[PDB]
Structures are given as C-alpha cells and as structure tokens.
Amino acid sequence: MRECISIHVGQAGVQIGNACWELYCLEHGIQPDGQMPSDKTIGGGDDSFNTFFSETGAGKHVPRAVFVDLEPTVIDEVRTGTYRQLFHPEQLITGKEDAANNYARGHYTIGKEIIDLVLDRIRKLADQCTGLQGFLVFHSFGGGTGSGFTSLLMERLSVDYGKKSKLEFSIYPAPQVSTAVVEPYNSILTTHTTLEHSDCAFMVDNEAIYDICRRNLDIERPTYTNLNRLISQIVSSITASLRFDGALNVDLTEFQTNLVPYPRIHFPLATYAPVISAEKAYHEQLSVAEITNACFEPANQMVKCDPRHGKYMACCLLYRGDVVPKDVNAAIATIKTKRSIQFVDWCPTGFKVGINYQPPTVVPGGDLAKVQRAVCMLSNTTAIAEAWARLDHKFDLMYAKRAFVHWYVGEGMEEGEFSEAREDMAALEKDYEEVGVDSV
Amino acid sequence: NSQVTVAVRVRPFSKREKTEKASQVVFTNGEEITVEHPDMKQVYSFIYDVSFWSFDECHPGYASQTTVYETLAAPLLDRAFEGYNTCLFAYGQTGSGKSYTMMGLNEEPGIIPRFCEDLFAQIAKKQTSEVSYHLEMSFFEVYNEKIHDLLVCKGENGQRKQPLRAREHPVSGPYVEGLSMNVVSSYSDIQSWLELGNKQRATAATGMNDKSSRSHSVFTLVMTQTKTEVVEGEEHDHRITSRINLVDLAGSERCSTAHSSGQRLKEGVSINKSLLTLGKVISALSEQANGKRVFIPYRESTLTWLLKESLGGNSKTAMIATVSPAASNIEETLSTLRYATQARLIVNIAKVNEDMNAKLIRELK
Amino acid sequence: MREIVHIQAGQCGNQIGAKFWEVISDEHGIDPTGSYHGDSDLQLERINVYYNEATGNKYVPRAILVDLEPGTMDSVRSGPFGQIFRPDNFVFGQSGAGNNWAKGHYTEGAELVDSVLDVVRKESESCDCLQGFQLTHSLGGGTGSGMGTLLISKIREEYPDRIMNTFSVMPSPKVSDTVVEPYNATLSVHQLVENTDETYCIDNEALYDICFRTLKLTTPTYGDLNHLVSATMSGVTTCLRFPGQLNADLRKLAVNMVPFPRLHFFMPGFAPLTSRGSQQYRALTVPELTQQMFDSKNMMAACDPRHGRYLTVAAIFRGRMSMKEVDEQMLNVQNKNSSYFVEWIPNNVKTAVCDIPPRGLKMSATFIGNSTAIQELFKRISEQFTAMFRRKAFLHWYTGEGMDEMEFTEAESNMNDLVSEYQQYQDAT
Ligand SMILES: CC(=O)O[C@H]1C(=O)[C@@]2(C)[C@H]([C@H](OC(=O)c3ccccc3)[C@]3(O)C[C@H](OC(=O)[C@H](O)[C@@H](NC(=O)c4ccccc4)c4ccccc4)C(C)=C1C3(C)C)[C@]1(OC(C)=O)CO[C@@H]1C[C@@H]2O
Ligand SMILES: Nc1nc2c(ncn2[C@@H]2O[C@H](COP(=O)(O)OP(=O)(O)OP(=O)(O)O)[C@@H](O)[C@H]2O)c(=O)[nH]1
Ligand SMILES: Nc1ncnc2c1ncn2[C@@H]1O[C@H](COP(=O)(O)OP(=O)(O)NP(=O)(O)O)[C@@H](O)[C@H]1O
Ligand SMILES: Nc1nc2c(ncn2[C@@H]2O[C@H](COP(=O)(O)OP(=O)(O)O)[C@@H](O)[C@H]2O)c(=O)[nH]1
Ligand SMILES: [Mg+2]
C-alpha cells in the first residue's frame, strides 16, 4: 500500500498537526481512542486507510506521524488532551530550552542530542511500509526549530533515503505582520540549505488567511484554531488521491514533476476557493466555473503576492466531490482566454487536473460550510520573487550594522554563513527573472 | 585623518598540491581578484587596496617578501618616527601562509624581522648626543576574552594561566594591569622572547591541523624619543612616544560542519565574536575616515579595547589577509576574502571566454 | 525543565520578593503552609520553575535572600508568607553596608558571598535544566548594588551560558533617598553592562504617578508600588509556566530585544491598570491594552519614549485573544508613529500570547521596551557624579575601604560611552 510520513516541527507545525489529524480521523471514521467501530459493525476494511494510519490487532489505528519540538509546553497539550490515546507516546520532545528564534541554536547546538532519536523513530515507521511515497514536513520560517532543525533533518534524509519526495508546508514570513525581529535571518539561511534537498515547498502567509477569513467567512477576531483548519484542508486535498477512490488521482511524485520545471524554482503557492460561511453557503451555485476562477482571484491567494506582477509556469488543480471533467475543461479554457493571466511561452499546456469522489467533511465547532465541491490550486508563479526581494532588503538593512549577529555566533556560526546565504538568495531572484523572460 | 590599508596575499601551490594536481580557483586581473568555482556556476570578484600575487615567480609584479614589506609595513615605521601609533593585523586560515609572510623562514624573512631590523638601523642612524631612543616590548595573548602573558615561566602546577585585568587610565587610555615589559637592544633579544612565547601560545590539534592557533597574540613595541631644546638653560626632556602593535588573529571556523563539542566550541565562539567586533570597529573607522559621524564600539571586546589608542585618532592601521588558491580550501578562501573586504562583493556568471579558438569573434566582426 | 533562581538583595529586593511570592503562590494556588488548594491542574504542571517539592506534597520556593541588616530578613519571616522559605536560605551577616558601595562589594560582601554561592550551587544542581537567574535589588544603596553586582560577576563566570535577568530600582531625578546615589549607581552600571543579558530599569517616581494619576490612590505605600513590579516579573515568565498559542521564554525575548550586547536596559510596563470604580466603564479588549502600554505615563522607568526611538519592544499577552487583533494593532502603532521607531529594523515588535490569564482578570499584558529615552538616567547620574567627584564630596568613605580614584573614572566613561552609543540611533539616518 502507498504511504506518506507526516513530520511536524515546532509550534507552527504541531498546532497544524492537531488540526490535520482532527480532520483525517473524522473522514475515515476514527474516534480519538484509535477505534473504528465501522469495521466492528461491517466486519473489517481498509477505511482506516493505511496511507496515514497504521493498524494493530486490538482495532487501534495509530497515525504515521512524528511531532518534534524543543518546547514541552506545546506537546503537553497533546499528551493531556483529547488525542492522547491515539499518538504513540514517542513524540520526541526535548526536556531542555528552545532555540530562542535562532538558526544556530536549532541547527547545531540544541539540534544535536535530539536528531538521532528523531531519525530512528522515522526509520521505524518506514520499515513498516511496503512502498513509501514521500514525506510531508510542516514547519515555519522565523523560528530556530522550524528553520534550523528542519534544515538539519532534511539534510540527513537526503542521505539515508535520497529518492523519496520530501515536501514542505511552510509559513512564509509576512511583509508587515511578524512576531519576531529576526524572522528574515532565520528564513534566508533556511532556503540556502533546503533548496538543494526539498523538492516542492508550498508556502502560506498568515496575513492572507487573516484577510481571507474577514472577506469571506466574516470572522473579524480569528485565532490560530481557524487558520489551521483551513490549512488542514489544503493537505487533505493533496493527500486525498492516496486515500479515496477517484477518476484522476494525483500522487505525490506528480506534483513534483508538473510544478517544478527547474530544480531551484520549487516554491509554489496554494489556495482554496470555496471559503464560504454557512449563511453564504446558500445563495451560491458553487460550480466548477465559479470555484475555479476564484483560485486565480488575487484576494483568495494564501500568499501576499499579486500574480499579475508575474507569470504562471505551472498550475495543478485538485477537484473534489461531484465534479464532472467537462466542466473542468470548460473552465481551464475560460482562463486561457483571459489576459490578466499571462503564462510563459515555454509551457503552452500549463495545467494539471486531479479529481476525487470523496467530498470534504465539516469539522464540528468550526466555520466552514458543507460544500459538495472543492478545489486546491497549486501554482508556480514568478511573482514570488517580489517577496524574496522584500525579505532580502530587510536582511541587508539590519545586517550591515551586524545587528542580532552575536546571538548566532554565540551558538556556533561564522559571519560568512550569512553573506554566503545572502549570495544564494540573490541568485534565485535572477533565476525567477531569467526563466520568466520570453524566448526568441 | 586615519585610513586602513587592506592587503590580500594569494600564496602559491605547495609540493603536495602540485603532486595531487589540485586545481586553481583564485585568479588575478591586475588589482582585482576573482574566484571561479570548479562547477562553473558563479564568479565572485573582490577588490582590495593592495594585492600580493605570490602564485608564480614569473608573472610581472610577483610579490616578493621585500615588496610586501616596503608596500605595507615600512611606512608604519615612518609614522612611528614621526610620532604616531601603528597596528598591523594578520588574518588567514591555516595552510594560507600567515606565518611565512609575517615571521618567515631563516632564508626568506618576513614582516616582523624586516620591520625590527630596519627600525634598529634607522635608530642607529638617528642616534646623536642630542636625541636618544628607548625600546620596550611586551607580548600577551587573548583566550576566551581573558588576558594572559606569554613571557613568564609556567610555575610548578598543573596549570599557571594566571589571568590579568584591563583598566582605563584617564590619560594613557586603556592598558593591561601587571603585564611585564622588557627592554630590548637587538633582534636577537626580540627573537628569543618571541620563540619563548609562541611555545606558550594556546594551540590544539583540531580537525584542520595538528597546531591551530586558539588565541589572539599581541606583540607591542613602545618606542620613546628623548630630545632636547633650549629653555634658557639646560636643554632637557622633550619626550615623544609611539606604540607599534603586531596582532596575529585566529581563524574563524564554522562549528556546524566541523563537529566540535566543549572547550573547542567555546574557543571557536569567542574567536568568531572577537573577529566580528573587530570588523565592526574597522568599518566604523573607514566611515570616520570618509567623514561620517560614527561611534566606534571599542569596548565590546578585549582586543579592540586594548588597541583603542592604536586604531583611532592619528594612528595607522594595516591588515594583511592571506589566502590559498587551491579548490579544496575554497570555503575558507571566500570567507577570508569577504572578511577582508571593506566596500562590497561583486558577483557575476560567465562561461563565454572559451571562444573555440583564438577569439573567433574577431574574424566574425 | 526551565527553572529560575530568585535572589533577593537588600531592603528593596527582600520586600519585593516577599510580595513576589505572595503573587505567584496565589497564581499556582499555594498557601503559606506550602500546601496546594487550587482548582485547575495547570497550576502544578510547571510548578518546578519557581518552587521545589517537599515531603507532604508541600512546595518550597527557590528563593535566596541575602542582606547585611537582619531587620529586613526578620520582617519577612514574621510576615504572612514567610513560613514557606527554606530557613537555610536566609543568608545574612552583620555590620551593614551603610549605603556605601565599597562595604557591600569589597569588605563585608567578600566575607559573605561564599556562603551565598553555596546555596546557589546547592539549588542550581538540583535542577534538571536551568534557564537563568532573577535578582531583585536596588541601586543607590550598598547591599543591593555592591553585594548584588559582586554576586552577578561570580555567577556569570561560573554559569556563563545562562541568563541573568535583573530587576533594578534606579535613582529618581527629583527626590533622592540617599545622598550618594550617583556613586553607588554609576559603579553598579559598570558591572551590569558587562555581566547581564536583560536588565529591567524601574524608577519609583514613575510608580508614584501611576498610583496617583491612573489608579487614583491617595495614600500609596511601598507595598502597593511593589504590587506593580511583582506583576511584571510574572508576566515575563508566563509562557514557561502556562501554555499558549505563541510562546516566549526569556532567551526568546533577549534575542529579539538586544541587538547589540550592551543595550540590554529596558523600560517595563503592565496593563491593564484602573481604579476600583472606573472598571465599570472600560471594556477589556486588545486595543485598550495596547494604548495603555505605549502611553508614556504608564511606563515604570521615569523617562519619556517620545524624546527617542524604540529599537525593539515586546508585548507578552495573557488571555484568550485573537492573534489578528494583536498583530494588526502592533502594526498600526509602527505605521502611525514611525518617528518613534527605528528605520533599519523593519519590525521593531514581537509578540507572545498565553492562554491562562491572571487570578481575577480576562486578559492582561506586559510591555518591555528598549528605547533611547533611557540615556537620560545615565546622563543625569553622570552629571550629579562629576559635580561631586570633581571636588571629592563624599569620597573618603570609599577610599578608606579599599578603592582608588581610578575605579570611579572607569565607571564614568563606560556610562558616558553607553550614552553616546544610544544617541547614534536617536538621530536622523
Ligand atoms: C475582584 C476584582 O475584580 O477586583 C479587582 C479590581 O478591582 C482591580 C482594580 C484590580 C485591583 O488592583 C489594585 O487594587 C491594585 C492596587 C495597587 C497596586 C496594584 C493593584 C486588585 O487589587 C487586583 C486584583 O487582580 C488580581 O488579583 C490579579 O490576580 C493580581 N493579583 C495579585 O497579584 C495578588 C496580590 C496579592 C494577593 C493575592 C493576589 C495579579 C496580577 C498579576 C499577576 C498575578 C496576579 C483584582 C481582581 C482586583 C483587586 C483585588 C481589587 C486591578 O489590579 C491590577 C493588577 O491591575 C486593577 O485592575 C485590575 C483589576 C481591577 O481593575
Ligand atoms: N499558521 C500558523 N502559524 C503559527 C502558529 N503558531 C505559530 N505560528 C508561526 O510561527 C512563527 C514564529 O516562529 P515559531 O513557529 O513559533 O518558531 P518554532 O518553529 O516554533 O521554533 P521555536 O519558536 O523556537 O519554538 C510566526 O510566523 C507564527 O505565525 C499557528 O498555530 N498557525
Ligand atoms: N608567499 C609564499 N611563497 C611561497 N611559498 C609560500 C608562501 N607562503 C607560504 N609558503 C609555503 O607554505 C608554507 C605555509 O606556512 P607554514 O607555516 O609552513 O604552514 P601554515 O599552515 O601556513 N602555518 P599557519 O598559517 O600558522 O597555519 C610555508 O612554510 C612555505 O613552504
Ligand atoms: N519600590 C520600593 N523601593 C524601595 C523599598 N524599600 C526601599 N526602596 C528603595 O531602596 C533605595 C534605598 O536603598 P536600600 O534598600 O536602603 O539599599 P540597601 O540598604 O543596600 O539594601 C531607595 O531608593 C528606596 O526607594 C520598597 O519597599 N519598594
Ligand atoms: Mg516554541
């Protein structure tokens, strides 16, 4: 059976893990105590689909996930919370301090003494798999553990495993909003190191979801328990092809090909069109044509980046529910007739389609509505350079005076590792420039 | 009024590298220096105020030891005898040739011996019945932001690294409390003291070498000129002093590739920090010389605080960064180059010089 | 796994500490018998930070009181919460400092600190993982400044990786309490600058105005003023004890607040404070906290940020809150008041939001600021200093105890250098 490993790192990933497994457990029919009475009443089945949940003899289904951190104060909401009887007690959480918004502290200093234990429990879950498809890493630029440890771990996995797809779901640092004065340093050092190892790193910006939650869902005072259910839907729309039956099923290796032309431009953006409240769930048709055009609407992009300042190199669409292909080809034709959507000349196709039959569910206590169709658009745009440059300029301003550097050197880091990283960040911005230029 | 003279020296291959046919990655175009990766992906360009291309004995402008001395160090003696303080910093990773340049062999001397002997010669020439000169010397080290002396005998103990303190005399600026100072009359005495001290300088067999320096060494010469002038009486006591400082810095070294725990890690951290503060002070000094209003953070590190009176003011600073041309040392090379740079790194990409023979484009034109 | 050693030096620390343990015990539900009478289970999950355990499920604080005048230490034992402290940690001597920095640093402190450090090593090695230290003392006197900074220098060499968070009552501009505050303070700053990571400057004049202008108190005593400092000391170390959405330890503040090593002096604050009557008129929302926090009158430092620029600030929130409402508001403060912020730091603010509010409140907030307005303290002391040292006004009570004219000048220059180190960023750029 086809399987995927879900690695969760730092506070930003763990709190998304709780939101993803709240959703996976609901769709298949699992209670928080690991049980699935459906097979007790039916007489067995693969409904507890083995891609994400492994099975024991007592009927308990354990998730294929690992929940790393350096703070105890985050995991201990899990070991004491609703889902304590689901996860293996091996959660790999360090009885020491955090990284204190420091790459050098998460990469080397207090990233070692832990990494070997993390890399074994990953090995144990992989030896239990009869054909592994890839990894799914959840972290956030801005911290030490989501920057450092994720750059330490992805290096070791490129050695031992090598050929398996290693995907990232990352919280891009926003331009105006931010919870740390040293997000840029921890972000530009990360891309220097992951860019050679990861294969496709989907990016989201917390600021865009804050706006998406205001315009559409009408939530003026959101929390992180509202952003992350909406992120949990992106991951499910990706991993649905491995779990449920469908007409066109897009595995992991197919995202890695259609969306990544050259090895260094694997930074696409995600979104989800039918963000509709219960009240506005009526008064809407919610057709493929209405849902599909909205994925290109800049307001509904989950990264603050106007696509109209750039060009699309590749775009993958993942439909769900009562979706008929003829309605999709009509849509993709309607998008190529427009002129605010300018593609590259070297990708006249541009598009990919995936269709499933299992509609999305509704996590109770939430805000999203019961819609019968859904879309997840994964786009590779040249616009995202404007975000790279905005971060680099923040880096060059406060690095010239060597502000906040001694906290990095004090954990083991050379001054030239900034500059080297800076050069790496100044290249990539030329590659996104060159590839977007029209050929002769 | 001041200005930092930055010089970069690219050594030649060694016999071992010539045997292994280690490739070349550092090139020259007159004054500019470049690094072209073996992967043919990026071309980094550096400019420095002075370059010393000791790669091939045949090329015009091959930097001899005398050329290096007469270009970088000797004007410091002119300013010293003029009555102004001087500092020469030496930086370079092990295997670059940081000692060959400074101290040198028995046959091909370096900056230290040429400097000291020329000093003695100029003194012997200027010595008369009216003017006299007096030379004192000291030799201390810095280790984990603590001071130690290099010219005492280790007592009968498991260790006698007796630390000392720094203090700010309101007039003479900062100084080191309890440091021994000795008088000198010849390079024999200077060489004897230095050869004693460099056995006590902290060194350990890291991964990169059997003997890599883990302390910042400071070698100070205080030169006092006693002259006389008519005061309607006994001409007496017109006194001038000048301080020469020769600093040997330690190498940076990252601790993420060079796995290293414990005392080695603490040493590397302190080295990295001191070098960072040194770079900040140097850039602040450059901006001050170019005329901006600048605050120089002398106090964020012991070396800067002790050398305050010999970098700022009407004082003359020089830095010599040593690099290797081989490809295996390329990370260290790029790091040292970036560190020695003061204005900006230049970057391009080019693979278009190979014009298939004899500049094909000419006949195309 | 993140434990703190509390140290209390002098008459200003030992009376704050007495209130500090009278505010944490009431949070974690501990009574003065050391026993637990709480309601939730969160109060005990991270009790290992400040308190240790004992036989009968009793909890003994990790406090180390130090002094040279027993009169203060004996006042604590007789107080309401005195009977929980470990009696072997009541370290004292005799022959008080006499408001002389020398006596508390050079003569009587040296003959006492070795007994103090034994208690520290005895507590530090009983901890699984040590975050840092927490000293509550006062400049202007002898014990807190002398014996405090002597103890800092020793712990920093012996425990160099760990944090030394300091809460310090600075001298006031108008109304002194000791005639030789400039001497006893300038020497203390010479030690704190080198040997600290984060120092919280408190000034009693600012606390009297907060008590009179906002709290509308007519007869405020020192126990009330300290009820404002005990609040900030807790808000800082909240996200170690209680869980939240975005957590922040002490180190996570220092990295985001100390851009250069020497500029670790902070202006604290606390929200929301109000009168016993005016609480029926003020809705507690996230915006109302943020305005009160950035208000010059609500800062405990006796300076005014509006004569300078914020280099970097911090807002440790406590309660159920919308993260958008926090991030929007901290953004709005910068884009409106950009002149009071630094251009070469793109965002001068961070955030931390905990989910367990205080004993009787829906939401609270702590504010920590690093501003160029803090130079007016050191420039003011540097003026009082040189006017006195130039004619040697009170100097013979120090030289007779093992000092010289040289150490006084070192204290002036490091302080006057730090002042200029702040002004460079205060100006146009
Ligand atoms: C029942 C009730 O709502 O009365 C309030 C009250 O009227 C006000 C005035 C309280 C009251 O504040 C004061 O009276 C006061 C006087 C001098 C100095 C400081 C405070 C109160 O004491 C404050 C006290 O709040 C707390 O108890 C916090 O938990 C506070 N408690 C203690 O520290 C404490 C001190 C001694 C003994 C036991 C507990 C706290 C603050 C920070 C961290 C932990 C705890 C409460 C609810 C009130 C009173 C009692 C009137 C407020 O207190 C604070 C910290 O702001 C002022 O605004 C809050 C809430 C109210 O406005
Ligand atoms: N989308 C989302 N982002 C979060 C959440 N919690 C924290 N973050 C993000 O995390 C970033 C700050 O860095 P952290 O993720 O806390 O750093 P870390 O990976 O946890 O490493 P440490 O901070 O040392 O524990 C900010 O950009 C936050 O937006 C969350 O629940 N959802
Ligand atoms: N300019 C030069 N021209 C020719 N040969 C040189 C030059 N500089 C250095 N060398 C050679 O390279 C060696 C480097 O110096 P040596 O002290 O032997 O090793 P080292 O690694 O440079 N010591 P260190 O730099 O302190 O780590 C010299 O001994 C010479 O043999
Ligand atoms: N805030 C506050 N300050 C105090 C208290 N007691 C003393 N002080 C301050 O302490 C200073 C005097 O220092 P002192 O404590 O006598 O020094 P010590 O004798 O060495 O401990 C004055 O500035 C007082 O304002 C108190 O209970 N609260
Ligand atoms: Mg954390």
Numbering used by the authors:
A (entry chain E): 1 to 440
B (entry chain N): 391 to 755
C (entry chain I): 1 to 429
The article reads:
As all kinesins, KIF14 possesses a highly conserved catalytic motor or head domain that contains nucleotide and microtubule binding sites, and where ATP hydrolysis is coupled to the generation of mechanical work. Here we report the near-atomic resolution structures of twenty KIF14-microtubule complexes corresponding to five distinct KIF14 constructs in four nucleotide conditions mimicking four key steps of the ATP hydrolysis cycle.
Construct K755 includes the neck-linker and part of the first coiled coil heptad repeat of the CC1 domain. The other four datasets correspond to KIF14 dimers forming a two-heads-bound intermediate with each of the two heads in a distinct conformation (MT-K755-ANP, MT-K755-AAF, MT-K772-ANP, and MT-K772-AAF). The new maps with separated densities identify the leading head with the undocked backward pointing neck-linker as the one in the open conformation and the trailing head with a docked neck-linker as the one in the closed conformation. Construct K755 does not include the full CC1 domain but includes part of the first heptad repeat.
